Amino acid sequence: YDFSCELYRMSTYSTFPAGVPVSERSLARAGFYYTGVNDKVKCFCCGLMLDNWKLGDSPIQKHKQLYPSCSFIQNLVS
Ligand SMILES: [Zn+2]
């Protein structure tokens, strides 16, 4: 289903900057791929864009909170 998709998302983090305080795996699992700019990531499903990640930030929570209508985030959490 989203099998290869999550794996593709993971691959986009090859250039992710070193000091970002959230794991790339968690980002990719939350539906986000890396835009190649700063620490800005984008949902493959709804296009929600997020950057300036802080220690302890939950990509899934931010995702659910900001753009609940995303089918991916709805199905991930259900
Ligand atoms: Zn989304």
What is the 3 state secondary structure string of the chain?
Answer: CCHHHHHHHHHHHHHCCCCCCCCHHHHHHCCEEECCCCCCEEECCCCCEECCCCCCCCHHHHHHHHCCCCHHHHHHHC
50 exposure class (CB count in 10 Å sphere: 0-12, 13-18, 19+): buried
Strand partners, 32: 43
Measured between its terminal Cα atoms, the distance across the chain in Å is: 15
CA of 30 to the centre of ligand 1 (A): 8
Ligand 1 center to residue 19 CA distance, Å?
Answer: 24
Under a CB-based contact definition with an 8 Å cutoff, are residues 73 and 63 in contact? yes
Task: Count CB-CB contacts under 10 A for residue 3.
Answer: 7
Separation of 11 CA from ligand 1 center, angstroms? 18
**How far is ligand 1, taken at its centre, from the CA of residue 66, in Å?**
9
The residues, ordered by sequence, that sit 6+ positions from 35 with a Cβ below 8 Å of its Cβ are 41, 42, 49
Query: Would you list the domain boundaries of the chain?
Result: 1-78
Resolution in units of Å: 2.0
User: Which residue, among 53, 15, 19, has the nearest Cα to 35 in the 3D structure?
Assistant: 15
* Method by which the model was determined: X-ray
For residue 27, report the distance from its CA to the centre of ligand 1, in Å: 12
Domain 1-78 has CATH 1.10.1170.10: yes
The strand order across the sheet containing 49-50 reads: 32-34, 41-43, 49-50
